[PDB]
Scaffold this active site. Structure first.
Site, PDB file in Angstrom:
ATOM      1  N   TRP A  65       0.803  -1.227   0.000  1.00  0.00           N
ATOM      2  CA  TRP A  65       0.000   0.000   0.000  1.00  0.00           C
ATOM      3  C   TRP A  65       0.835   1.276   0.000  1.00  0.00           C
ATOM      4  O   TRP A  65       1.613   1.503   0.926  1.00  0.00           O
ATOM      5  CB  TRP A  65      -0.930   0.019   1.219  1.00  0.00           C
ATOM      6  CG  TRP A  65      -1.844  -1.128   1.247  1.00  0.00           C
ATOM      7  CD1 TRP A  65      -3.048  -1.217   0.627  1.00  0.00           C
ATOM      8  CD2 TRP A  65      -1.602  -2.400   1.848  1.00  0.00           C
ATOM      9  NE1 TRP A  65      -3.574  -2.473   0.787  1.00  0.00           N
ATOM     10  CE2 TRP A  65      -2.706  -3.229   1.537  1.00  0.00           C
ATOM     11  CE3 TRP A  65      -0.558  -2.932   2.621  1.00  0.00           C
ATOM     12  CZ2 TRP A  65      -2.802  -4.563   1.968  1.00  0.00           C
ATOM     13  CZ3 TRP A  65      -0.653  -4.262   3.053  1.00  0.00           C
ATOM     14  CH2 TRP A  65      -1.768  -5.060   2.722  1.00  0.00           C
ATOM     15  N   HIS A  94      -7.457   1.414   1.795  1.00  0.00           N
ATOM     16  CA  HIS A  94      -8.466   0.395   1.524  1.00  0.00           C
ATOM     17  C   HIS A  94      -9.634   0.586   2.488  1.00  0.00           C
ATOM     18  O   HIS A  94      -9.546   1.374   3.424  1.00  0.00           O
ATOM     19  CB  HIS A  94      -7.888  -1.019   1.602  1.00  0.00           C
ATOM     20  CG  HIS A  94      -7.119  -1.327   2.856  1.00  0.00           C
ATOM     21  ND1 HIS A  94      -6.569  -2.570   3.096  1.00  0.00           N
ATOM     22  CD2 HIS A  94      -6.778  -0.561   3.922  1.00  0.00           C
ATOM     23  CE1 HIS A  94      -5.922  -2.557   4.249  1.00  0.00           C
ATOM     24  NE2 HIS A  94      -6.034  -1.352   4.772  1.00  0.00           N
ATOM     25  N   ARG A 120      -4.202   6.026  -2.798  1.00  0.00           N
ATOM     26  CA  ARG A 120      -2.886   5.400  -2.911  1.00  0.00           C
ATOM     27  C   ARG A 120      -2.000   6.394  -3.647  1.00  0.00           C
ATOM     28  O   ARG A 120      -2.446   7.057  -4.583  1.00  0.00           O
ATOM     29  CB  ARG A 120      -2.954   4.121  -3.726  1.00  0.00           C
ATOM     30  CG  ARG A 120      -3.915   3.102  -3.187  1.00  0.00           C
ATOM     31  CD  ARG A 120      -3.320   2.308  -2.064  1.00  0.00           C
ATOM     32  NE  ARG A 120      -4.175   1.168  -1.719  1.00  0.00           N
ATOM     33  CZ  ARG A 120      -4.528   0.192  -2.561  1.00  0.00           C
ATOM     34  NH1 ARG A 120      -4.108   0.200  -3.820  1.00  0.00           N
ATOM     35  NH2 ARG A 120      -5.300  -0.811  -2.140  1.00  0.00           N
ATOM     36  N   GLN A 134     -13.426   1.198  -3.650  1.00  0.00           N
ATOM     37  CA  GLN A 134     -13.443  -0.238  -3.376  1.00  0.00           C
ATOM     38  C   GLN A 134     -14.741  -0.590  -2.679  1.00  0.00           C
ATOM     39  O   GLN A 134     -15.469   0.297  -2.225  1.00  0.00           O
ATOM     40  CB  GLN A 134     -12.323  -0.607  -2.435  1.00  0.00           C
ATOM     41  CG  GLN A 134     -11.036  -0.925  -3.095  1.00  0.00           C
ATOM     42  CD  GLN A 134     -10.064  -1.559  -2.128  1.00  0.00           C
ATOM     43  OE1 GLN A 134      -8.867  -1.614  -2.395  1.00  0.00           O
ATOM     44  NE2 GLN A 134     -10.574  -2.064  -0.997  1.00  0.00           N
ATOM     45  N   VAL A 177      -5.904 -12.362   6.351  1.00  0.00           N
ATOM     46  CA  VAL A 177      -6.741 -13.546   6.059  1.00  0.00           C
ATOM     47  C   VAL A 177      -5.878 -14.762   5.875  1.00  0.00           C
ATOM     48  O   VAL A 177      -4.754 -14.659   5.385  1.00  0.00           O
ATOM     49  CB  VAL A 177      -7.571 -13.439   4.746  1.00  0.00           C
ATOM     50  CG1 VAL A 177      -8.863 -12.700   4.978  1.00  0.00           C
ATOM     51  CG2 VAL A 177      -6.749 -12.775   3.636  1.00  0.00           C
ATOM     52  N   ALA A 230     -13.945 -12.616   4.313  1.00  0.00           N
ATOM     53  CA  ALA A 230     -14.059 -11.258   3.798  1.00  0.00           C
ATOM     54  C   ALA A 230     -13.491 -11.251   2.396  1.00  0.00           C
ATOM     55  O   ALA A 230     -12.681 -12.127   2.044  1.00  0.00           O
ATOM     56  CB  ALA A 230     -13.327 -10.287   4.665  1.00  0.00           C
TER      57      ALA A 230
END
Ligand SMILES: [Mg+2]
Ligand SMILES: [Mg+2]
Lengths: 266, 356, 266, 214
Positions: A65, A94, A120, A134, A177, A230
């Site tokens: 990022w 994000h 970004r 997003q 995740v 997610a």
């Protein structure tokens, strides 16, 4: 005689931005699957944007990022429960932080979708922007498994591109995740696989952050025996390939000759 | 306990009901018995999860399309009205329409003895009813509903009446036919469709203000002023209205990347014999202007001296624009000539052209 | 000087009918539960309105509906698959027929909600109309059970009246369902149980009618091993007690002074 | 096969990862291993069914309320515009506003070195940009977006410019202040709220045509 073909009084007629149309199209798809739309702040703190989501200081992941850092005195950023949250300020890279903000303030089970503008630091070209949008989802509860994740994205594909649409999942890495994956949809009319986004099962450390922070604010913990998945996806990417917009720079270009073309789209 | 005789050891029993329970014939009947004696309260709560069979996908597009139509309409400024499906047969006369195709054998009343063939008659009545009870200075209504004739079909209809739009503390106002036609052109740009009105007579409409609505090239209904005689019989002021047949055509998005190069402007007036419809002239200038015409607009409508009497002039602002590059003057010029040529070949004159 | 407080140009501002607002409110509630809205014809044939739904000639049940019969030559009523359907014409007394029309043309599983205008021969009073609106749902699939029916209505109550809302079910009779029931919602702010509608598990004979008719048209049967539940409710009843409308006769009364009050309701 | 040493007979094994797999620390890490070697394709499809916990009910009212606002606006006739969150610090001067509260340490460019305090400045610029590229005879825009000052807050802003409303082939037209005030009174009746304008001065506004919205 009265000439009926003569132009009548010229009242104005509005229209919606391509992105609002697209965003609306994705939210209703998920609403049908029981997901509620909640929004979050654009100016975030490093804690919610990086730390809670398992992305720590001086770590390869942080390089994924390109953050815009902020400076400014006398600005109040308030946490989930209206508390003054302390951290180094930034423009969110994000929408994921909102998922931590939600979890600390609500108790499971639930299903949410959070659309949002993200930033970004990048050099804006025909397919790159520094400011874009997003949409991320989160389902948490007892027994939520990856099968349920594959099912949701399957329903997304079916809704956007038809019954003859199929999804594909492959392993990829995200600090927040595990398992993690990237998903692509078979767009039958384009005759090619489209890489749409990422997804995975919420990381153990994200739930620990949530509870630990809940405890800090006096709330009992709620994410001890739950699992959850997610996913997150880019809106411009869809909007372009769905409405046929060649240059991502049109979106924020504000040209009436561009925007007016989308008057008919509902 | 209920009196049934149960035979068998299971899993499938042979239960024969008492002679006085005429309602016990199927197995389901018996499962309801277990339920009511145990209590419906004992049935737990639960939610189902499944992927719908393929043919059920997209099944709501229609309902959704019509619901957005109503929303776009209320957005513009139209006020929704609900009206009974029933019609007074006599009305088919008062309004000059063909008689009703479906009539009731057991009507609530004679005036409600038929099924409506059109929507407008009803709107017009609620209009009068409103004027008598309260005296509105204006109204702009709309209704979407079923209409019955040969086939059952959905219609959209609206009506404008009263003073109009303008500054409250001033007299200059926008109203009547061209105001209603405005709200309609506005409505149609939002739906992203091509809308056009060609003049044509309708029994119920006023001869001098009567026309047919052409959505995406097809006749879907009308628009005009209520015929004065019908107006007189019903004791109403003038009213303007329209009625269309839904669902309107559907036109997909064809993105057209706009040119990053400057447009070329040009003004021109066409002298036309008074009876010639503005729409016909517009179509001509347009068809002749070429592939580089971007915009064509009417800014002045004049007829009098020293214009050869029985003639009018139509002022047009034109705009030519070339996609890949800027246009050479000879391109615009030569192009405005193709217009001027065919303009005169139809028998029209050029009151002005090539004005910066 | 320019007086800013002076009224500006008087553009018109629209509004939606109380019933459209209410209908919209109920459809979105079910959309969130995965239900799709489909409409049906107002002029029906006795087959779809009575016969297929287990309500036969000279039978007590037929007395529950006060039918408006129709006469008229040269009117084409077309069935589910565009076929000319033959029967004695009538104005529908309920939306249920559409549920048979749907089943013959689609295959399970699915979840649908069909809002619609219905007619009954009655003397119109402050709480009775001859023309009003209903909303019926139908879920069919392998394993659909009454528990799922109680769950749906539970979700309806929660959405209309809050978390402190509770539903109640009791036995009642309908020719087209078995078990059958009537449901009431605990409206906490009104401190009383409201009788909302009926529901039950689709009757075996309704599925047989569907398949038998499918076979007649050349379609293979699809309702052999499925179960399903259906419920139906009145819209005016809700609309009145939710917006506070005292007289049901206002709905079709067309008075601008009445309708304008609902401009602010979304 | 992956090199781990598995100890135990089950149901809970003690699996110790190879020294070269720095990524294998938790049990989840190990479940991903079973998944990628078996193949993500082997994971079946499914949908979850549950009643959401009470506090999640009604959670979308806000999002829904703002989305209807945009819809009512486009319905009336306003054209939506999206504008960057960034602001030129110098603009705070050109338009006569208090200076920006949040500035970037790593801006894309100097003119994008701050976070917008107001929405209008941007609309006004896209207006000019449009006039130069194409020469619109009129415009009626609107934008809903975040604005940053003391707190992050959402704003709604619009702008009317050009000839106005009237018969194309006539000169008499409705325009300017009272036309914009019209679209606003119209807008407010639809939202069912009480709207009023009292005169008050604003640095950026015109003294003779300036008022506060109530
Ligand atoms: Mg029974
Ligand atoms: Mg891993």
């Amino acid at each position: 005689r009265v000439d009926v073909s003569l132009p009548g009084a010229s009242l104005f007629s509005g229209g919606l931005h391509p992105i609002t149309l697209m965003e609306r199209e994705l939210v209703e798809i998920f609403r049908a699957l029981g997901y509620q739309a909640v929004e979050g702040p654009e100016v975030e703190s490093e804690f919610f944007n990086f730390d809670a989501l398992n992305i720590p200081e001086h770590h390869p992941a942080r390089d994924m990022w390109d953050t815009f850092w902020l400076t400014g005195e006398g600005f109040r950023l308030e946490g989930p429960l209206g508390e003054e949250v302390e951290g180094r300020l930034l423009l969110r890279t994000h929408t994921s932080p909102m998922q931590v903000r939600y979890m600390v303030a609500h108790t499971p089970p639930f299903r949410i979708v959070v659309p949002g503008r993200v930033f970004r630091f990048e050099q804006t070209d025909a397919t790159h922007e520094a400011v874009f949008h997003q949409l991320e989802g989160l389902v948490v509860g007892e027994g939520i498994a990856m099968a349920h994740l594959k099912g949701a994205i399957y329903e997304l594909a079916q809704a956007l591109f038809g019954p003859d649409s199929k999804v594909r999942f492959q392993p990829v890495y995200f600090p927040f995740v595990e398992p993690g994956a990237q998903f692509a949809v078979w767009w039958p009319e384009g005759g090619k696989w489209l890489e749409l986004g990422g997804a995975g099962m919420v990381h153990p450390k994200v739930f620990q952050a949530v509870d630990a922070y809940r405890e800090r604010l006096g709330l009992p913990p709620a994410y001890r025996g739950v699992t959850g998945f997610a996913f997150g996806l880019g809106v411009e990417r869809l909007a372009m390939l769905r409405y046929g917009i060649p240059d991502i720079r049109y979106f924020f270009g504000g040209r009436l000759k561009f925007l007016e073309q989308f008057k008919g789209v509902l | 306990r209920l009196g049934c005789r149960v035979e068998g050891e299971g899993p499938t029993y042979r239960v024969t009901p008492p002679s006085h329970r005429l309602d016990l014939r199927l197995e389901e009947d018996l499962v309801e018995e277990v339920a009511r004696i145990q209590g419906y309260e004992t049935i737990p709560l639960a939610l189902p999860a499944f992927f719908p069979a393929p043919d059920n996908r997209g099944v709501e597009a229609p309902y959704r399309k019509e619901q957005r139509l109503r929303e776009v309409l209320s957005g513009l400024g139209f006020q929704e009205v609900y009206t009974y499906s029933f019609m007074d047969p006599e009305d088919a006369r008062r309004f000059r329409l063909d008689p009703p195709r479906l009539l009731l054998l057991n009507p609530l009343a004679p005036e409600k003895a038929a099924l409506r063939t059109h929507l407008f008659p009803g709107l017009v009545r609620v209009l009068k009813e409103n004027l008598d009870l309260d005296r509105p200075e204006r109204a702009l209504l709309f209704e979407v509903g079923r209409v019955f004739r040969e086939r059952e079909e959905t219609h959209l209809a609206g009506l404008l009446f009263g003073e109009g739009v303008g500054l409250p503390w001033a007299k200059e106002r926008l109203s009547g036919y061209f105001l209603l036609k405005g709200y309609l052109e506005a409505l149609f740009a939002r739906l992203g469709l091509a809308f056009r009105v060609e003049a044509q007579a309708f029994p119920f409409l006023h001869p001098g203000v009567s026309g047919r609505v052409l959505v995406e090239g097809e006749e879907v209904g009308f628009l005009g002023a209520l015929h004065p005689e019908i107006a007189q019989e019903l004791e109403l002021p003038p009213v303007h209205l329209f009625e269309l047949r839904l669902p309107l055509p559907d036109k997909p998005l064809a993105f057209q990347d706009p040119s990053r190069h400057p447009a070329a402007f040009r003004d021109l007036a066409v002298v036309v014999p008074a009876p010639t419809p503005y729409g016909e002239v517009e179509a001509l200038v347009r068809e002749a202007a070429g592939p580089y015409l971007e915009s064509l607009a009417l800014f002045d409508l004049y007829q009098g001296p020293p214009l050869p009497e029985g003639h009018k002039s139509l002022a047009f602002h034109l705009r030519f624009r070339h996609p890949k590059r800027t246009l050479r003057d000879e391109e615009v010029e030569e192009a405005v000539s193709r217009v001027a040529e065919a303009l005169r070949a139809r028998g029209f004159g050029l009151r002005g052209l090539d004005t910066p």
